Design a binder for this molecule. Structure first.
Ligand code: M1P
Ligand code: M1P
Lengths: 349, 344
């Protein structure tokens, strides 16, 4: 099944490798990095999750107050108004809170393996009401007009999608919430088709639907419409519970090649391939029957049974994905375009 | 709390008053009408729900066949793979079906009271994959460029929002699904602000959120962005469970006046008032503490629901049309100045 060539140095980055970005917090997780080239280097835009030192019998976590300043909230673990069954999202008196706060952090490399913070390139932290609980899982589209970031915006009122733009990775323009709750896994295409922009996204339905891959179009990147359902989950398959796009699709001669993630009802996450028509990206030409990558390395099963990619580089036939493993550490692997197309029974020349 | 002046002829229309739009089916519900003026008359754009005659031991419901024609599907009541416990949504082998299909139906009036079908003006049925389970709860914006319809699109993959445009109520242009699932209660503003279009909407969150009133902007009506949360539910209030906009807001000197609906955890629906800033409609200037209208007439409890997504305005008098008990169509008047006074 698995056709990924893992980097021998995996994991490349773990929580212990970096100093905490938020005063008095500690890094619990590094994951789901955006990937791009800039100034001769390979860059990761890390999702970094932080929280305070946990005292016994007490769950403690950061929030931004109304003034955009960091504070700490805490609950007794045995509080009868607390549901802490999920370790990511807790409930207290009918309201939801995250156990950590995520922000986006830049690291660079000259070899694609050893990464470090770069002086003059500080992190991107959540701003405003709709990002009070943090920002997550940022895709980076490298385009002729610069870099477009599409990420989860989290608050007490929404899990939604934001977009920002940069040329220099120091100043940013923010386009607001482009897609309302409940939505994430937003993969902007790096070029126009038929004079429009396109993105994959992933709305969640409480009923009459599920967690499927969708398409939307835009004339301007700020405003989105003409929504289309591209690919659902598949009953009795590895991807029966939820699907979502990763990074931007790769332009091949046979179509748009999309490395998506799918999960089963055991919360095991694997990677598959979708091939969409060049001119009509809502049209599926091919889909992996089995995964092309599964969480089978030791570091892909800790703490659990998760690989997740939302960033890659492509050089000829070689795709270099960067990925989160166990929602905790950062890893690299290579895949072959032609091998994927061959396995998919797609003709190539 | 209730300050509505109900029309003495309520209900204006009940299921029995109309012949079925789909041959041999029964009208179960008339509700939640769009409202507009055209060719000197008052029109309603009804939500009509139909299903076949129910036979003993058999649950039957409408489907689109492969040829896009309305037909019937049926299951034995004692089938062990059938869950027909809910009367709105049934389950069979892990797939969901609605028990009725909704479409949009035009009726007109010369007096605002007695409505009838108009020859030459047939109904609007769902078309395409994203409307396979019907269309619902259509808001009608009357604008200088004609009429814009914003309605629920329902299918097995999504409850989302569609938009159509018409000048003559015979020919329509369809702009597709403007808002993805899970969304409805889309109230398009009838004029631009700072050279953009605005709409209220109502995404539903499985967690980290709820069912709140949201705002979006557009340069072109087809494409939407810059989403903003306008008003949440209120813990301990009549509107603790869910809120949603009705029709387009009314332009007043004090701001945009929006007659919204809100529900509690007993599924009682009432109407309230929201006042938004003229230039920044995401900004709430005032909100009714109590409802301005509650389901207290007999026909509003046959269950404890009033719902409006259409109205006319003549001076200080708002004439709302509304669904009552999710079954019948009714009319009432409200005073702009009385609402604004309450809101101080
Ligand atoms: O909604 P999705 O596409 O299933 O992804 C979610 O689960 C992943 C696995 O824990 C996480 O890595 C992601 O951050 C996200 O919370
Ligand atoms: O999502 P909302 O705004 O709370 O409204 C829903 O419930 C109303 C009352 O049953 C219905 O009348 C509506 O059609 C809708 O199903």
């Amino acid at each position: 099944m698995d056709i990924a060539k893992r980097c021998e140095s995996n994991p490349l980055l773990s929580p212990k490798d970096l100093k905490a970005g938020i005063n008095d917090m500690e890094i619990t997780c590094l994951l789901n990095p955006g990937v791009f080239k800039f100034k001769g280097k390979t860059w990761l835009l890390l999702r970094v999750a932080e929280r305070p030192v946990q005292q016994e019998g007490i769950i403690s976590f950061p929030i931004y107050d109304e003034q955009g300043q960091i504070k700490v909230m805490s609950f007794a673990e045995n509080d009868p108004d607390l549901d802490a069954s999920d370790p990511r999202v807790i409930g207290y008196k009918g309201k939801n809170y995250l156990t950590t706060m995520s922000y986006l952090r830049l690291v660079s490399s000259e070899d694609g393996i050893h990464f470090h913070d770069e002086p003059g390139y500080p992190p991107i932290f959540g701003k405003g009401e709709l990002e009070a609980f943090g920002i997550e899982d940022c895709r980076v589209a490298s385009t002729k007009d610069g870099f477009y970031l599409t990420f989860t915006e989290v608050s007490s009122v929404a899990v939604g999608v934001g977009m920002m733009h940069t040329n220099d990775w120091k100043t940013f323009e923010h386009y607001g919430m482009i897609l309302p709750p409940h939505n994430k896994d937003c993969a902007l295409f790096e070029e126009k088709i038929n004079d429009k922009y396109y993105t994959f996204h992933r709305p969640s339905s409480p009923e009459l639907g599920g967690n499927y891959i969708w398409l939307a179009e835009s004339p301007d990147l700020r405003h989105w419409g003409n929504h289309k359902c591209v690919a659902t989950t598949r009953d009795g398959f590895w991807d029966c519970a939820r699907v979502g796009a990763g990074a931007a699709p790769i332009k091949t001669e046979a179509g748009w090649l999309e490395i998506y993630h799918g999960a089963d009802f055991n919360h095991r996450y694997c990677l598959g391939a979708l091939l969409l028509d060049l001119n009509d990206p809502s049209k599926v030409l091919a889909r992996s029957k089995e995964p092309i990558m599964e969480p089978i390395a030791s570091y892909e099963q800790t703490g659990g049974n998760v690989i997740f990619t939302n960033g890659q580089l492509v050089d000829g036939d070689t795709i270099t994905i960067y990925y989160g493993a166990s929602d905790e550490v950062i890893c690299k692997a290579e895949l072959s375009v032609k091998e994927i197309l061959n396995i998919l029974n797609v003709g190539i020349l």
